Amino acid sequence: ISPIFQGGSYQLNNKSIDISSLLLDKLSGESQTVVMKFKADKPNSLQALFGLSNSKAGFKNNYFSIFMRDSGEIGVEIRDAQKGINYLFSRPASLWGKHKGQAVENTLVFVSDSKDKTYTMYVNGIEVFSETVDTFLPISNINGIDKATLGAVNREGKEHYLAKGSIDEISLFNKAISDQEVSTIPLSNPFQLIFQSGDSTQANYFRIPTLYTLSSGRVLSSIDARYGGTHDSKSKINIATSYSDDNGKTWSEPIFAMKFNDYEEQLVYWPRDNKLKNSQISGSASFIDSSIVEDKKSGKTILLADVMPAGIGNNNANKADSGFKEINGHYYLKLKKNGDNDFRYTVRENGVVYNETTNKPTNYTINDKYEVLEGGKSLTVEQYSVDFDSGSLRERHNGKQVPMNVFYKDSLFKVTPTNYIAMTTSQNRGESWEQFKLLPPFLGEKHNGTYLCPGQGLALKSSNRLIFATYTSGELTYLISDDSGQTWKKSSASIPFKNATAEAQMVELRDGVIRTFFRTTTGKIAYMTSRDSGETWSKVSYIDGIQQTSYGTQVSAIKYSQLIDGKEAVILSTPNSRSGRKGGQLVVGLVNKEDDSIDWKYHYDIDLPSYGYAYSAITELPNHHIGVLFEKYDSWSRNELHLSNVVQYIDLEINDLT
Ligand SMILES: O=S(=O)(O)CCNCc1cccc(F)c1
């Protein structure tokens, strides 16, 4: 079906455009599709792009509108006072504003389907909502519609929700076009998706992106594949990876680097209403916060992530217990058996499960995958699936058996309910990953483990040294390996905060000189410096010229390979805002070789100051472009939970930044 109306190049300059004559008598039947290509790089706080209204006295609540907010939220209202219907459907963080300083053409498709009683909205090729109702209201079946309007809604003869922007193309159809037909509509996106809803991970949500450029030129990305909405652990989360061999143009189907099987990998539409949005998968083990590095010596890729046993997050993790027991020099994972009230077992050498009460070995062993064997025979547990069919979250057995893992709720032997760090390696640059190993405790038997800083580890250019930053109360705890990650030692660096989420990322300014940038609770990004390849660390300083919120946001950083303005250059990625996670910037700093101080000379705004930007990953692509994979939404805001396809990838050149 071809359009019943088609128009274009409308400038919305705080003055509505009447298209009633052109459109109203074209609308027929109960199903409609609106296709609109529009720009708004300077939107008003709340504005309507398109309206169908009853403009008469006493019918101010009889209208259909497509509206947007300066937060990037998109939505519709469908209202009829006589029918007593006031529908409002929307999703935050659905829009782009600007890319490389030019207004982005957003492609909006809204489908109003009378047969399925469903309203569906897509923006930039992403389905942002699909709502089914019991009582369907066709958009031109509103009582007394007499105006079709661009850039406002006409209510009682006056202009409401006046817009600033432009509509380059608008088409309407007297049909609810299919999901297939929608897929064929040309897009003008400034971004790409690496991970996305419906891909091989089957997670509907993603958080905590990473990027790392490998020596072969392959670019590797890791991420939290988050199943139970966007909630941190406790939840179900796996670590997924994807790579690009063509400088970020295309990406491989994801595989898992770290995954648990105690709960099904389910693509679930997590509820966003206030009563249910804090529903949380409460009995699954999870991985969270990955970080990547490449080792030149072995050629291996190394990935670490936090590990959380069933039902555990940072909120309830046993502080005061590492989960290991010291036996004269060595660290052994503790285990609690079904029915015991204490942890009377340890995993000794060769995975042998050992009874600490009688110093006796058992017939149980723990394999490489942390699965429980009895006499060489693999034990199993029944898997769980989750659903909201009952009206609340239900977690229940699904009839499938999976290998029994000591991180599981249903396991015969269970680890201490605290946080761990695991490592996995790849010998094929991310085509497959090994079974993970737990790192040993670094701060003692009675200290819970540190938290990995997501993003990149650091491979010093002039040596074999590998470093992963981690954080805990009162310090950064750098984990250092000189033997391809086979053994690790810690290097502790005091910071003047208690309990900070001090997510830290490192750059090598020059041989042996490391600057670490980190999240604080002060509203400023901090930094410290090592001049001996991470053995010792300076006191903490703060960057002026960038603002973060009181709670802070992860910051990513790289040392650029090429000189800028004749100087060594560092690039920082972070929100720049004291209010929320928004106003994303890449900030280019030039190093003063007199004292290694940095002058933050260029600020590149990734999109509008009001549009969301949270955790991020940055890398120098082999062609010297800059790749950025980032949460394009406010991942703190309690209004922006459980959004799909907001972690997005862009390609930039240094001349775009400067
Ligand atoms: O600042 S945010 O709230 O967006 C993310 C912080 N997540 C920290 C964390 C890290 C490891 C395990 C957890 F349960 C939680």
XYZ file of C-alpha atoms and ligand atoms in Angstrom:
673
model
C 0.000 0.000 0.000
C 1.245 3.471 -0.949
C 0.729 6.521 1.291
C -2.575 8.387 1.536
C -0.584 11.510 2.365
C 3.031 12.499 1.844
C 4.734 15.800 2.584
C 8.154 17.166 3.413
C 10.585 19.945 4.326
C 8.472 21.498 7.058
C 10.292 23.917 9.337
C 8.904 23.923 12.861
C 9.919 27.268 14.332
C 7.565 27.561 17.306
C 4.664 27.942 14.894
C 2.345 25.087 13.950
C 1.633 24.097 10.344
C -1.962 23.251 9.451
C -2.317 20.256 7.114
C -6.004 19.568 7.794
C -7.036 20.303 4.191
C -4.468 17.852 2.868
C -4.918 14.990 5.335
C -8.182 14.723 7.255
C -10.452 13.525 4.435
C -7.752 10.992 3.464
C -7.951 9.134 6.790
C -10.138 6.020 6.523
C -10.643 2.821 8.489
C -9.436 2.055 11.995
C -5.752 1.228 11.414
C -2.995 3.730 10.567
C 0.782 4.059 10.164
C 2.753 7.297 10.500
C 6.253 7.444 9.027
C 8.201 10.595 9.903
C 11.784 11.722 9.325
C 12.560 14.645 11.605
C 15.307 16.685 13.232
C 15.291 18.354 16.600
C 18.713 19.504 17.679
C 17.284 22.302 19.805
C 13.996 20.931 21.113
C 11.694 22.654 23.568
C 11.178 20.907 26.937
C 8.019 19.209 25.686
C 6.833 19.434 22.093
C 4.426 17.759 19.686
C 5.681 16.748 16.260
C 2.276 15.718 14.926
C -1.295 16.190 16.082
C -4.830 15.191 15.206
C -7.279 17.106 17.372
C -10.789 18.330 18.026
C -9.962 22.033 18.207
C -13.411 23.061 19.486
C -14.357 24.673 22.809
C -14.916 22.045 25.497
C -13.031 19.244 23.747
C -9.455 20.012 24.788
C -8.842 16.388 25.759
C -9.850 14.955 22.395
C -6.635 14.498 20.468
C -3.910 12.228 19.167
C -0.312 13.425 19.304
C 3.230 12.246 18.754
C 5.385 14.131 21.255
C 9.009 14.234 22.381
C 10.843 15.712 25.378
C 14.237 17.412 25.558
C 15.373 14.307 27.504
C 15.084 12.332 24.242
C 11.871 10.633 25.313
C 9.311 9.893 22.565
C 5.636 9.052 22.934
C 2.004 9.362 21.930
C -1.230 10.461 23.543
C -4.584 9.132 22.325
C -7.445 10.864 24.107
C -11.242 11.000 23.841
C -13.284 12.451 26.702
C -16.578 10.967 25.529
C -15.134 7.440 25.408
C -13.307 8.133 28.656
C -9.980 7.115 27.127
C -6.662 8.806 27.940
C -3.831 6.682 26.607
C -0.252 7.795 27.093
C 2.529 5.525 25.815
C 6.180 6.536 25.781
C 9.796 5.567 26.255
C 12.668 7.704 27.546
C 15.966 7.921 25.636
C 14.638 7.078 22.147
C 16.125 9.898 20.057
C 19.323 11.322 18.608
C 19.870 15.068 18.395
C 23.263 15.779 16.843
C 26.212 13.766 15.520
C 29.475 15.434 14.482
C 27.676 18.707 15.196
C 24.984 18.122 12.567
C 21.300 17.551 13.276
C 20.435 13.837 13.078
C 17.504 12.723 10.921
C 15.490 10.414 13.159
C 13.212 7.907 11.459
C 9.984 7.403 13.395
C 7.409 4.721 12.565
C 4.180 4.576 14.562
C 1.748 1.729 13.929
C -1.850 1.841 15.169
C -3.351 -1.619 14.664
C -7.083 -1.972 15.261
C -7.120 -5.713 14.574
C -4.537 -6.594 17.219
C -5.590 -3.604 19.362
C -1.924 -2.638 19.552
C 0.064 0.597 19.280
C 3.720 0.182 18.291
C 6.482 2.800 18.006
C 9.868 2.425 16.313
C 12.575 5.063 16.237
C 15.775 4.645 14.217
C 14.953 1.004 13.559
C 14.391 0.248 17.228
C 11.061 -0.806 18.697
C 10.688 1.448 21.747
C 7.201 0.368 22.798
C 4.356 -1.972 21.837
C 1.182 -1.675 23.881
C -1.972 -3.783 23.596
C -5.242 -2.440 25.043
C -8.640 -3.954 25.775
C -10.463 -0.947 24.351
C -8.815 0.191 21.125
C -9.052 3.859 20.070
C -8.349 4.473 16.363
C -6.384 7.725 16.040
C -8.844 9.403 13.664
C -11.863 7.949 15.449
C -11.530 10.563 18.189
C -14.831 12.438 18.647
C -14.916 15.582 16.480
C -11.373 15.625 15.048
C -11.154 18.733 12.875
C -7.421 19.561 12.710
C -4.253 17.844 11.484
C -1.225 19.743 12.765
C 2.589 19.660 12.554
C 4.649 21.098 15.389
C 1.763 21.566 17.847
C -1.591 20.218 18.960
C -4.510 22.597 18.406
C -6.588 22.642 21.591
C -9.571 25.010 21.820
C -8.080 27.043 18.968
C -4.674 27.503 20.621
C -1.199 26.028 19.992
C -0.090 23.569 22.685
C 3.271 21.753 22.839
C 4.863 24.094 20.269
C 7.892 22.486 18.602
C 11.288 23.636 17.417
C 12.727 21.313 14.782
C 11.980 20.131 11.271
C 10.042 17.358 9.587
C 11.881 16.406 6.415
C 9.401 13.681 5.449
C 6.015 12.570 6.715
C 3.789 9.829 5.273
C 0.539 8.303 6.506
C -1.016 4.987 5.541
C -4.493 3.585 6.091
C -2.994 0.309 7.181
C -1.064 -1.134 10.092
C 2.103 -2.094 8.222
C 3.838 -5.311 9.298
C 7.059 -5.672 11.291
C 8.587 -6.892 7.990
C 7.510 -3.827 6.035
C 8.813 -1.613 8.853
C 12.222 -3.318 8.549
C 12.431 -2.137 4.910
C 12.105 1.587 5.689
C 15.434 3.352 4.982
C 17.221 4.753 8.029
C 19.726 7.547 8.507
C 21.201 6.401 11.805
C 24.398 7.966 13.148
C 25.041 4.785 15.155
C 25.311 0.975 14.980
C 24.342 -1.806 17.357
C 26.900 -4.458 18.311
C 24.721 -6.171 20.896
C 20.916 -5.984 20.548
C 17.625 -7.499 21.681
C 16.968 -10.802 19.939
C 20.589 -11.569 19.155
C 22.428 -14.763 20.118
C 22.651 -13.741 23.810
C 18.875 -13.627 24.100
C 19.212 -10.865 26.694
C 16.775 -8.014 26.147
C 19.083 -5.533 27.962
C 22.788 -4.633 27.975
C 25.015 -2.518 30.211
C 28.724 -1.932 30.894
C 30.309 -1.879 27.373
C 34.028 -2.382 26.730
C 36.231 -2.044 23.615
C 39.797 -3.123 22.992
C 41.886 -3.035 19.810
C 43.912 -6.230 19.299
C 47.352 -6.359 17.618
C 45.937 -8.187 14.577
C 43.625 -5.215 14.017
C 40.550 -7.045 15.248
C 38.494 -4.877 17.622
C 36.964 -6.758 20.551
C 33.975 -5.738 22.678
C 32.582 -7.221 25.870
C 29.377 -6.351 27.747
C 26.935 -7.370 30.474
C 24.143 -9.348 28.805
C 21.407 -8.480 31.335
C 18.341 -10.708 31.420
C 16.278 -9.430 34.359
C 15.943 -5.860 33.156
C 18.889 -3.495 33.539
C 19.288 -4.149 37.292
C 22.808 -4.822 38.660
C 23.262 -8.179 40.399
C 21.439 -9.880 41.995
C 19.991 -10.830 38.593
C 20.850 -13.088 35.736
C 23.700 -11.585 33.707
C 26.213 -13.235 31.384
C 29.324 -11.695 29.817
C 29.097 -11.578 26.003
C 31.675 -10.616 23.381
C 31.663 -9.600 19.699
C 34.479 -8.503 17.395
C 34.993 -6.464 14.226
C 37.620 -7.162 11.576
C 36.839 -4.133 9.440
C 37.518 -1.166 11.747
C 34.114 -1.354 13.412
C 31.972 -1.426 10.271
C 30.463 -4.860 11.017
C 30.414 -7.050 14.105
C 30.283 -10.805 14.720
C 27.291 -12.544 16.309
C 27.979 -12.517 20.040
C 29.214 -15.504 21.989
C 29.589 -15.825 25.755
C 32.883 -15.280 27.594
C 31.298 -16.143 30.954
C 27.887 -17.711 31.505
C 25.911 -19.620 34.103
C 23.112 -22.105 33.299
C 21.076 -22.191 36.535
C 18.482 -19.913 34.908
C 17.352 -19.983 31.261
C 18.625 -17.305 28.882
C 15.278 -15.559 28.352
C 14.412 -12.498 26.318
C 11.913 -10.886 28.703
C 10.063 -7.576 28.515
C 10.742 -6.337 32.040
C 7.907 -4.236 33.529
C 8.526 -0.474 33.655
C 5.565 0.564 35.819
C 6.280 1.855 39.320
C 4.768 -1.138 41.122
C 6.832 -3.799 39.332
C 9.974 -2.222 37.832
C 12.045 -3.196 40.850
C 11.211 -6.852 40.255
C 14.546 -8.634 40.350
C 15.657 -12.157 39.495
C 16.618 -13.234 42.985
C 17.934 -16.779 42.791
C 20.365 -16.734 39.828
C 24.156 -16.624 39.812
C 25.594 -13.808 37.697
C 28.681 -12.186 36.178
C 29.035 -8.383 36.066
C 31.580 -5.710 35.039
C 34.002 -7.166 32.462
C 37.439 -5.852 31.480
C 39.755 -6.887 28.626
C 43.499 -6.852 27.899
C 45.802 -8.427 25.325
C 49.105 -10.092 26.278
C 51.889 -9.642 23.706
C 54.042 -12.486 25.032
C 51.490 -15.291 24.736
C 49.235 -13.509 22.245
C 46.258 -14.449 24.405
C 43.287 -12.215 25.133
C 42.403 -12.057 28.810
C 38.974 -11.154 30.181
C 38.070 -10.679 33.835
C 34.627 -10.042 35.371
C 33.066 -10.044 38.839
C 31.262 -13.266 39.822
C 28.168 -13.320 42.018
C 26.711 -16.495 43.540
C 22.939 -17.109 43.398
C 20.936 -14.217 44.806
C 24.039 -12.085 45.483
C 24.834 -8.477 44.537
C 27.064 -5.757 45.996
C 24.281 -4.854 48.464
C 24.152 -8.215 50.257
C 27.610 -9.662 49.529
C 29.347 -10.856 52.691
C 31.851 -8.152 53.509
C 34.244 -9.708 56.085
C 34.642 -12.955 54.131
C 36.860 -13.585 51.084
C 35.241 -16.985 50.529
C 38.642 -18.647 50.811
C 40.390 -20.233 53.800
C 44.147 -19.951 54.385
C 46.010 -23.165 54.971
C 49.634 -22.250 55.809
C 50.440 -20.168 52.729
C 47.701 -21.104 50.263
C 44.096 -20.112 49.524
C 41.285 -22.648 49.149
C 37.679 -21.987 48.138
C 35.289 -22.730 51.001
C 32.119 -24.788 50.479
C 28.955 -25.356 52.531
C 27.074 -28.639 52.148
C 23.276 -29.045 52.057
C 22.101 -29.034 55.680
C 25.261 -27.792 57.388
C 25.070 -24.438 59.159
C 28.756 -23.677 58.643
C 31.269 -23.980 55.802
C 32.981 -27.267 56.626
C 34.539 -27.954 53.248
C 37.305 -26.582 51.049
C 38.274 -27.158 47.439
C 41.855 -28.385 47.751
C 44.267 -29.297 44.975
C 42.911 -31.124 41.910
C 39.413 -29.941 42.809
C 39.225 -32.466 45.635
C 36.423 -31.525 48.028
C 37.810 -31.825 51.528
C 36.188 -31.934 54.962
C 37.752 -29.422 57.364
C 36.128 -31.002 60.429
C 37.742 -34.414 59.979
C 40.555 -33.300 57.653
C 39.160 -35.995 55.372
C 38.831 -35.907 51.578
C 35.399 -36.685 50.087
C 34.173 -38.561 47.063
C 33.206 -35.168 45.589
C 35.335 -33.151 43.171
C 34.941 -29.731 41.576
C 35.792 -29.672 37.891
C 37.323 -26.844 35.847
C 33.884 -25.304 35.271
C 33.156 -25.245 39.039
C 30.689 -28.079 38.533
C 30.208 -30.792 41.169
C 31.188 -34.387 40.436
C 30.578 -37.414 42.647
C 32.999 -40.240 41.828
C 33.654 -38.701 38.422
C 29.923 -38.568 37.701
C 28.436 -35.133 36.946
C 25.683 -34.004 39.310
C 22.831 -31.863 37.962
C 20.236 -29.339 39.136
C 16.936 -28.363 37.523
C 17.034 -25.023 35.666
C 14.752 -22.064 36.447
C 12.760 -19.840 34.086
C 11.119 -16.526 34.996
C 7.718 -15.050 34.072
C 5.208 -12.351 35.058
C 2.120 -14.343 33.987
C 0.791 -14.238 37.561
C 1.104 -10.455 37.722
C 4.331 -10.558 39.716
C 7.770 -12.086 39.081
C 7.816 -15.866 39.433
C 11.010 -17.941 39.337
C 10.339 -21.635 38.857
C 11.741 -24.968 37.718
C 11.440 -25.625 33.986
C 12.120 -29.381 33.739
C 15.600 -29.082 32.257
C 18.679 -30.477 34.013
C 21.990 -28.616 33.863
C 25.393 -29.336 35.412
C 25.476 -28.660 39.174
C 27.607 -25.549 39.836
C 28.857 -24.406 43.249
C 27.642 -20.883 42.423
C 24.031 -22.129 42.112
C 21.114 -21.920 44.558
C 20.260 -25.618 44.142
C 23.802 -26.953 44.435
C 24.761 -29.618 46.982
C 27.910 -27.567 47.699
C 27.737 -23.746 47.793
C 30.381 -21.028 47.868
C 30.399 -18.153 50.344
C 27.737 -15.563 49.403
C 30.180 -12.799 48.465
C 31.741 -11.286 45.327
C 34.634 -12.904 43.434
C 36.737 -12.068 40.389
C 37.093 -14.587 37.558
C 39.430 -14.699 34.583
C 39.017 -16.353 31.177
C 41.347 -16.383 28.184
C 40.995 -16.726 24.420
C 43.653 -18.198 22.093
C 41.751 -17.125 18.981
C 41.087 -13.427 19.605
C 37.546 -13.877 20.891
C 36.230 -16.688 18.697
C 36.029 -18.869 21.815
C 36.741 -18.452 25.527
C 38.184 -20.880 28.098
C 36.394 -21.987 31.248
C 36.960 -19.277 33.867
C 39.228 -19.442 36.925
C 38.696 -17.557 40.167
C 41.457 -15.128 41.116
C 42.811 -15.647 44.666
C 42.103 -13.221 47.548
C 44.416 -10.192 47.593
C 43.490 -8.365 50.789
C 43.333 -11.339 53.156
C 41.134 -14.191 54.354
C 38.592 -11.969 56.112
C 38.225 -9.250 53.473
C 35.639 -9.606 50.724
C 37.176 -9.328 47.272
C 37.641 -6.134 45.309
C 35.432 -4.998 42.435
C 36.811 -5.035 38.902
C 36.923 -1.733 37.047
C 35.021 -2.298 33.822
C 36.587 -1.542 30.462
C 40.225 -2.230 29.653
C 43.160 -3.586 31.549
C 46.534 -2.087 30.622
C 49.302 -3.832 28.661
C 52.444 -1.781 29.177
C 54.054 -1.128 25.789
C 57.692 -1.710 26.796
C 57.295 -4.811 28.956
C 55.192 -7.924 29.547
C 53.392 -6.325 32.499
C 49.594 -6.603 32.591
C 47.454 -4.550 34.985
C 43.756 -4.637 35.874
C 42.451 -1.907 38.164
C 39.936 -2.889 40.841
C 38.324 -0.904 43.652
C 37.389 -1.421 47.264
C 36.671 0.687 50.317
C 39.462 3.230 50.767
C 41.718 2.273 47.842
C 42.316 1.271 44.267
C 43.749 -2.243 44.164
C 45.704 -2.802 40.972
C 46.208 -6.429 40.006
C 49.579 -6.928 38.292
C 50.853 -9.870 36.227
C 54.212 -10.301 34.482
C 53.584 -13.881 33.337
C 50.634 -13.687 30.927
C 48.104 -13.621 33.747
C 49.144 -16.928 35.321
C 49.966 -15.193 38.613
C 48.871 -11.856 40.067
C 50.048 -9.551 42.821
C 48.311 -6.483 44.163
C 49.495 -2.914 44.318
C 47.385 -0.806 46.688
C 46.786 2.924 46.188
C 44.981 4.816 48.940
C 42.147 7.142 47.939
C 40.405 9.690 50.227
C 36.983 8.069 49.993
C 35.237 5.400 51.955
C 32.838 3.187 50.003
C 33.268 4.889 46.618
C 32.400 3.111 43.375
C 35.881 4.129 42.278
C 35.794 2.761 38.734
C 39.247 3.451 37.314
C 40.751 3.302 33.819
C 44.429 3.726 32.918
C 46.548 5.300 30.163
C 50.295 4.925 29.599
C 51.484 8.530 29.126
C 54.983 7.324 28.243
C 57.106 4.263 29.012
C 56.479 3.177 32.599
C 54.281 6.206 33.391
C 50.617 5.372 34.072
C 47.834 7.855 34.732
C 44.646 6.445 36.158
C 41.360 8.334 35.842
C 38.595 7.413 38.266
C 35.024 7.970 39.395
C 34.560 9.620 42.785
C 31.850 10.918 45.103
C 32.987 14.559 44.720
C 31.455 15.595 41.413
C 34.925 15.625 39.868
C 36.819 12.867 38.090
C 40.049 12.086 39.962
C 43.442 10.830 38.854
C 46.678 9.441 40.254
C 50.029 8.635 38.620
C 52.586 5.830 38.760
C 56.109 6.278 37.362
C 57.317 2.748 37.973
C 54.915 0.610 35.950
C 52.323 0.414 38.731
C 54.520 -0.450 41.747
C 53.767 2.809 43.585
C 51.138 5.525 43.158
C 50.869 9.282 43.663
C 48.354 11.146 45.774
C 44.937 11.891 44.254
C 44.268 14.974 42.101
C 41.077 16.158 40.421
C 40.185 17.358 36.931
C 38.635 20.810 36.665
C 36.547 21.489 33.575
C 34.463 18.329 33.675
C 31.476 17.833 35.991
C 29.975 14.568 37.187
C 27.114 13.940 39.587
C 27.597 13.314 43.299
C 27.286 9.555 42.638
C 29.541 9.632 39.570
C 29.831 7.625 36.367
C 32.403 5.264 34.882
C 34.973 7.096 32.753
C 36.878 5.520 29.850
C 40.278 6.686 28.587
C 42.941 6.012 25.972
C 46.363 7.227 24.960
C 46.035 8.292 21.302
C 48.863 7.097 19.020
C 49.223 10.323 17.030
C 50.305 13.805 18.081
C 47.663 16.508 18.286
C 48.763 20.138 17.992
C 52.275 18.696 18.249
C 51.543 17.140 21.628
C 51.027 13.702 23.147
C 47.255 13.228 23.534
C 44.892 11.434 25.938
C 41.163 11.097 25.227
C 38.558 10.844 28.046
C 34.949 9.644 27.613
C 32.393 10.633 30.256
C 29.102 12.384 30.855
C 29.715 16.096 31.541
C 26.911 17.126 33.898
C 26.393 17.692 37.609
C 22.704 16.793 37.318
C 22.407 13.396 35.631
C 24.077 10.925 33.278
C 23.748 13.073 30.151
C 25.793 15.491 28.078
C 28.274 12.905 26.845
C 31.679 14.193 25.793
C 34.992 13.071 24.448
C 37.573 15.403 25.983
C 40.963 15.661 24.311
C 43.872 16.367 26.631
C 47.353 17.414 25.580
C 50.250 16.314 27.773
C 52.810 18.846 28.963
C 56.083 16.896 28.933
C 57.600 19.356 31.429
C 55.535 17.866 34.240
C 53.111 15.387 32.604
C 50.220 17.707 33.426
C 47.297 17.588 30.988
C 45.544 20.498 29.339
C 41.994 19.505 28.444
C 41.845 21.494 25.240
C 38.933 20.101 23.182
C 35.454 19.007 24.296
C 33.417 17.062 21.728
C 29.748 16.808 22.535
C 28.555 13.314 21.539
C 24.933 14.502 21.430
C 22.781 17.163 23.160
C 23.667 18.183 26.721
C 20.199 16.966 27.787
C 20.406 13.558 26.062
C 21.549 10.524 28.023
C 25.116 9.262 28.227
C 26.415 6.897 30.899
C 29.013 4.111 30.986
C 31.234 4.126 27.915
C 34.056 2.416 26.082
C 36.540 4.056 23.755
C 39.261 2.654 21.531
C 41.620 3.802 18.793
C 40.635 1.765 15.754
C 43.503 0.463 13.566
C 42.804 3.211 11.009
C 43.228 5.859 13.745
C 39.507 6.568 13.923
C 37.908 6.479 17.392
C 35.245 3.887 18.214
C 32.830 4.610 21.052
C 30.412 2.048 22.528
C 28.230 3.652 25.171
C 25.040 3.593 27.195
C 22.937 6.226 25.423
C 20.599 6.782 28.381
C 20.655 7.688 32.040
C 21.514 4.343 33.639
C 21.112 5.862 37.109
C 17.651 7.339 36.616
C 14.800 5.345 38.095
C 12.712 6.541 35.133
C 14.974 4.953 32.462
C 15.223 1.360 33.668
C 14.743 -1.581 31.319
C 15.307 0.073 27.931
C 16.266 -2.021 24.897
C 18.971 -1.118 22.360
C 20.361 1.995 24.082
C 23.959 0.729 24.184
C 25.149 2.034 20.829
C 28.362 2.352 18.788
C 29.667 5.328 16.795
C 32.744 6.029 14.673
C 34.593 9.338 14.992
C 37.691 10.950 13.471
C 40.042 13.175 15.458
C 39.135 16.149 13.269
C 35.518 15.704 14.424
C 36.726 16.113 18.011
C 38.937 19.151 17.515
O 26.699 3.192 39.088
S 25.759 2.110 38.654
O 24.715 1.908 39.662
O 25.112 2.444 37.376
C 26.650 0.553 38.462
C 27.457 0.039 39.639
N 27.461 -1.403 39.743
C 28.347 -1.859 40.785
C 28.333 -3.334 41.035
C 29.507 -4.110 40.728
C 29.505 -5.467 40.953
C 28.360 -6.080 41.454
C 27.193 -5.329 41.753
F 26.108 -5.954 42.236
C 27.200 -3.938 41.528
